[PDB]
From a paper:
[name] (GP; EC 2.4.1.1) is the enzyme that catalyzes the first step of glycogenolysis toward the production of glucose-1-phosphate. GP is an allosteric enzyme according to the Wyman–Monod–Changeux model and, through effector binding, adopts two interconverting states, a low-activity (T) state and a high-activity (R) state. GP has several ligand-binding sites that can be exploited for inhibitor binding. The structures of rmGPb-EGCG and rmGPb-[name] complexes were determined by X-ray crystallography, showing binding at the quercetin binding site (QBS) in agreement with kinetic studies that revealed both compounds as noncompetitive inhibitors of GP, with EGCG also causing a significant reduction in cell viability and migration of U87-MG glioblastoma cells.
The 2Fo–Fc map also showed that [name] binds at the QBS although a high concentration of [name] (15 mM, 3× more than EGCG) was needed in order to achieve binding, reflecting its low potency toward GP. In comparison, the Ki value of [name] was calculated to be 285.5 ± 14.1 μΜ for rmGPb and the IC50 value for hlGPa was 193.8 ± 3.5 μM, revealing that the gallate group of EGCG confers potency. [name] forms 22 less van der Waals interactions (overall 85, 7 polar–polar, 37 nonpolar–nonpolar, and 41 polar–nonpolar) compared to EGCG. The lack of the gallate group and its hydroxyls explains differences mostly in polar interactions and also in hb bonding. [name] forms 3 hb with protein residues in comparison to 5 of EGCG. The hydroxyl oxygen O19 of ring A makes 2 water-bridged interactions: the water-bridged interactions O19-Wat1037-Cys495 (O) and the water-bridged interactions O19-Wat1847-Leu494 (O) and the hydrogen-bridged interactions 1 hb with Wat1848. In addition, (O21) forms 1 hb with Wat1103, and the overall [name] forms 8 hb interactions. Arg551 is at a 3.58 Å distance from ring B and Lys544 is at a distance of 3.23 Å from ring A, participating in π–cation interactions. Superposition of the binary complexes of rmGPb-EGCG with rmGPb-[name] reveals a shift (RMSD, 3.31 Å) of the Glu120(OE2) side chain upon EGCG binding due to its hydrogen-bonding interaction with hydroxyl oxygen (O44) of the gallate group.
Residue numbers in the entry:
A (entry chain A), B (entry chain A): 7 to 252, 260 to 315, 324 to 835
Write the structure that this text describes.
Amino acid sequence: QEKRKQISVRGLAGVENVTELKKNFNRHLHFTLVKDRNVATPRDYYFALAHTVRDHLVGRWIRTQQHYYEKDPKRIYYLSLEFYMGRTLQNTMVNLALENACDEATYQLGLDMEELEEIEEDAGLGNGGLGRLAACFLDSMATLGLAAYGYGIRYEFGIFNQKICGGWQMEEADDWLRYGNPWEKARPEFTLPVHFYGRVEHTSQGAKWVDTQVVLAMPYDTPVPGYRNNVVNTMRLWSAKAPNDFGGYIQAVLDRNLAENISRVLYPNDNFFEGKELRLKQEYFVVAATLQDIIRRFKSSKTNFDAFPDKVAIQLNDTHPSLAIPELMRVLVDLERLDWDKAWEVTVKTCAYTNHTVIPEALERWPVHLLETLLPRHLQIIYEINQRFLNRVAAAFPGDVDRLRRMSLVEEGAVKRINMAHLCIAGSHAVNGVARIHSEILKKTIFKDFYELEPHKFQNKTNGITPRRWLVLCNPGLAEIIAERIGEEYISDLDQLRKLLSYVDDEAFIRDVAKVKQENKLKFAAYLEREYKVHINPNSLFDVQVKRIHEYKRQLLNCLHVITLYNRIKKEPNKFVVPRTVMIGGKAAPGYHMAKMIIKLITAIGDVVNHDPVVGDRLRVIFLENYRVSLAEKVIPAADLSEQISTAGTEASGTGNMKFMLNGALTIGTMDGANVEMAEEAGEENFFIFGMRVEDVDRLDQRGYNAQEYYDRIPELRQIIEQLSSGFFSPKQPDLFKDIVNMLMHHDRFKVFADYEEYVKCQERVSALYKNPREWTRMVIRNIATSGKFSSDRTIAQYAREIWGVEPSRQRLP
Amino acid sequence: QEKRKQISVRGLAGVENVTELKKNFNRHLHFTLVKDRNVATPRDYYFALAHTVRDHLVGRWIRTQQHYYEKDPKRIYYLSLEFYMGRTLQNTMVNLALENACDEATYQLGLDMEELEEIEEDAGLGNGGLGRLAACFLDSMATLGLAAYGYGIRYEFGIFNQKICGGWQMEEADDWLRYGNPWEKARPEFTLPVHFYGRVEHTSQGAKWVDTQVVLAMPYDTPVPGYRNNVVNTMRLWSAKAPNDFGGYIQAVLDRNLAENISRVLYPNDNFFEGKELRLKQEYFVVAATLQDIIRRFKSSKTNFDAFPDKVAIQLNDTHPSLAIPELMRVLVDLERLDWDKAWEVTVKTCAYTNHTVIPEALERWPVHLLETLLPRHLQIIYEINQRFLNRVAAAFPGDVDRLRRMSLVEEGAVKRINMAHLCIAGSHAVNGVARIHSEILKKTIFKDFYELEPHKFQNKTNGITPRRWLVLCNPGLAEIIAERIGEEYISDLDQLRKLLSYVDDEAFIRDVAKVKQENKLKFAAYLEREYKVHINPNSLFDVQVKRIHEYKRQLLNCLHVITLYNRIKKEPNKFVVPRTVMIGGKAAPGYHMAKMIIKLITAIGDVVNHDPVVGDRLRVIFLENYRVSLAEKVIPAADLSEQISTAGTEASGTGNMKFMLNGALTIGTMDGANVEMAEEAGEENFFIFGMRVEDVDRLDQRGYNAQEYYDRIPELRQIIEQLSSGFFSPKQPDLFKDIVNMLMHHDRFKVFADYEEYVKCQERVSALYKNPREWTRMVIRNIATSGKFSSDRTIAQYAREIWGVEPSRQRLP
Ligand SMILES: Oc1cc(O)c2c(c1)O[C@H](c1cc(O)c(O)c(O)c1)[C@H](O)C2
Ligand SMILES: Oc1cc(O)c2c(c1)O[C@H](c1cc(O)c(O)c(O)c1)[C@H](O)C2
């Protein structure tokens, strides 16, 4: 519509700017897409605009990288197996201040820019929180003027496209490069060899890794624009390519596929270590090519590796790139011929490690035999690291043999394994958790032994989200009513949102907050109708739980509440209840039968609830298909209630929680992860906090969790388990949910029933507030106004000062 | 050098043209290659110029295709499994008249354009003659203003890169898309489904092909510029892509490779049918996607399929796309619901078939079981075609049962097979050979039965080469001395070269012809030094045999001559002989042990000859590595003597013969293929014709070829076989050549020894003429001057008028 073109936060439609954009658009359509308007599809128009927008950061990208070469700052390398980037077109336009100019130029050409934006494929190179965190981090590091590089893998297929067929998840290949990627620049001239297998021989000079198989790593560079500071940083993603030279000639050519399979697809396993050789190869591939780049940049600067930690930070996003530690030692000792002790000093001062979960099944514990076959030299180095590290433990804690056994990089058993978390702590000068409660649990329990050896190593860095994608882009309406009162500085200084507490009693701001939410809901309600012919009641409370499907996130607890609301309506059909649209979305890991069963249960509950004429428009429950970064940008601004209901102690931080808080949703949740700090910032009176705290969970584990006690004492819970058992939600297959029932009653590691009573009552309080629109909106104002801490600019500023030793700067390039 | 910039045939360096080219060059380097001159490699500079040159044909390409849509001419579809295109940059510049402007613009930027041209990968999507013929044909059809489309497969790997290691061929993957292809435009929006396997069911309506596996065919469009007529035609190459939807999720994603393997690599088997399922899939893939395109274009024009043959010609390059015939019948009968007899009338009037060899092992004879599994509906249609075709044979030739058995599409035996040549003749209104002697043998022997049923079907179309790539581009020096005398019209009217017979006695032209040859030889001699550190004597006769390595091409006969020259020098070291550099090059099919042994024999003869101090610079024999279109453009203009020495009756035409004739080489050859017509055009007195004619070969077959008789009667031959046997050319492995010796003495299908005596004497006459430079050059003038018939413009004009029913035109577009 025109209205959106009038949005001040979207910048200026300069006459000359608009004229040049139209000309460059038409130029790309003719010379780049080789089409005239006669035959051009919306896809052609999307690509013409994407090429036009990309041209506007080429000068800045070249100048930024030239500026780092000349000024030689310390370089930050963010190593991750995942970059959950989403779409690039709107983000680029926001960060370059081109959004209103492009909007006007496309409008004058007869085009709806927002329809074109829907054509762009997500770069879905992530599973969830960790991947999206890497993405928010690249944006904040560019905005803070850091000389920062994202390093990862250019997966041919990202996280699988989820279809729901017969109420079940079906997985399809996320063919995101089908139509090409206008953002990336292939750098095949900067291709590097990566080695696999082979053997270690010992020459006059020392160890030599020989007889290896080569896979080439071909880098692809994507631009990362800072917010209006003329800074354009690089995300470098490596693509696997079969080496130059070699069933027959034909089979040998087809067999190039096996090496190229290394970058073929993202492992969709979110919170579970599988131990697949191909995943190990992906981890070594990204670490090996990346560290060659890092060493090359270091040596072409203003040799003596003493200065390497003053010019390089390597940040390990989880244990996935943990092989950086032995790889850096391998390069320094075997190729640069440093003494072991000097090499180790350099390695520890270079590397830092971010831990993202305490869940034991997440821990990377590679079989020694697999390491011995694939990476023989890395295994030798790991054993040497282990010897020297345990010698330090023995000196600090003389005769504490149990501690030596617990701290060892080597795990004894039927299969001997390397603990990659232990390797990361040993080879890193800093270890951080991703929220205060998580970082304290790391020092208290999980890494207590490591904390006692080296307390100075252990840090907190509470996660954050970029206010650019998660407010200005996704919710320009809310960004606009904020700018109208406090100006635009908050977009890169989010603590300025605290100025909004001055408007808790301002009739105009109260009106405007509620109006923006209603607009967002009408647009999302429309979306469901247009793309899925799904009708939702737009005067309903939007109750949203979007995140990966896991027992620990307790989508099942949400299911028990939804069926509780259904059964209360049936018992007292005459009694008024606040109408709800309950939306659950997210992907289940291919495999995880239980996660796939929970998706079927959500759709099955919907099948009953949504067709009961007594319920009608008072309650609707819908499974949002293919939850991904692009769909998060649509549903989160439309949300009234944010479900953050993980068992206390299980969610290290969460970032979806922060997105909802920034976009004018109230939160129902446990005192878990960053929920604790969110409630602290806003005041607990402005959060719907319920359920067991970590210490209540621990007291239940101490005496044993008996789900039967809850079943016996709670009539409403008993009625629901009996509906699930007897086939009420699967009449044509009455035993369909027996595995869910049996897990809840006898094998529930996440104590669903133990929080049921507090959850249902807490949800009653939510409904009671929603019936009072003014006080609902006033409480929302108090949440948005205190969301500033959860800016990833704040997080990155802390990494820069406390771990990397660099000073951030919002000062602009010319 | 500057001199080449002064070449009038290379066009004008307009001041504004040069200024715009430099600006667009710098523009591409910044916005396309994202590099500033600081860091730019010669590769960046090549790509910047390629993008700049490509931009200059975008308007013409769009207008040409729009012009065909509006004027609705009959469309020519040239279906081939091979397009042996070579490099595109220089060809584009020649056809757009930009060569001197680009040369000047790059010069002003401090760049050598010819060094940049060496960076471009050949599009090596061909094996040899048939593939390069398809390439010359696209060029001539554009130059003749035909509404012509090349349709083929976008192989990820073309013909293998040949390395010589220890004197043996080694094959490497021809990774021609490593750095990208600036010429092609991906059209993923015009992606089409191709079906494989499945089964035939019979509904109310008729046959239905069901339960198939889908492979997507994604088209890539390359421009084909005519010579300065503003015409830009299309080569559409299909890429295999796994369908949208589906060992586990991960194995299912990796298994997309199996479908994508269909377009992975060119079968390097030049003159041998192998019967590989994957080759059958490539043949159906190109035919199926192509015929969907053809039908779509037909229906979006100014339904009734009665007009289809008035608006479509399908030219089948060999039997490789022979499935077009049953596929067109399948579409017309099963999907468009035409009566069988009407469908057949349409199919025969649409399709024509070009035969390229009489060698039995070349004939495509697919097992019926393979067809039944992969293409069940095509097999049914082929059986129906066969029934109706043999019914016509039975009516024409009542009671001739032997003729029914010989003409059948179905070949009886242990394995029953479909003869694809028989299918092509049945389903085509025209059948042609590729030289007069070949086309007459087709009517006399191979297809005699078919000629007798339908004599009107059988045509000759003598092959040709484009005078653009094979004279103006590769030999601008010779193009220039010709233009100086007769102007530039000959470049698209090559019969104008006959005007050069007026200069046989012209002292200045004689001087200039010899000077251009000497320049070409000095440049090729330099090339060997720069790229291979190989020294050649530049006052030596350049004796060149470049072509695929096959027993029928008799590289071995050349080897016996080279060793004859070596042994004569050793016997009479004091006797003067014309110094020679004997150059043999070409690829052996992976497999063909004998072809690989012949390459080793050439290098082994070189190892002795090139290190014998008695011989010194008087005789050098070198194996030219990686013979391909780009290397043909270098060596052929430097050649003095063209070896075309195939056994009479074995080479259908040849095109290398024509390239040498156009570039000022004299020819030693058999009365075989187009050699016959070349000698007829120039006068036999201007050719070194030797050896058995077809009827002498036939008389030897009638009484039996006994190689021993030649061995017993020829002392010099006996001495050579004994050197090969005893290990003179393999001292460290004395029996290394026993298989070559045993084949020559007992299993020689190509009668090498039978032409030995005439060959050696004919070579004596060559040397005798070379000792007289004036008369050598005068005879060259008489060859170049009469090469005009062998223009592919002449060939295409004949296809257009005699088979396609369209009138050619050199008249320009605005
Ligand atoms: O930021 C948002 C928020 C939303 O709730 C929606 C958004 C974008 O775009 C969708 C959409 C789909 C299409 O298929 C279109 O063509 C189109 O223009 C917009 C739909 O309106 C819902
Ligand atoms: O048409 C011809 C004819 C030839 O005989 C040669 C040609 C081109 O280019 C080669 C060459 C190789 C390189 O590596 C270069 O850099 C370069 O400029 C030229 C070499 O001179 C030999």
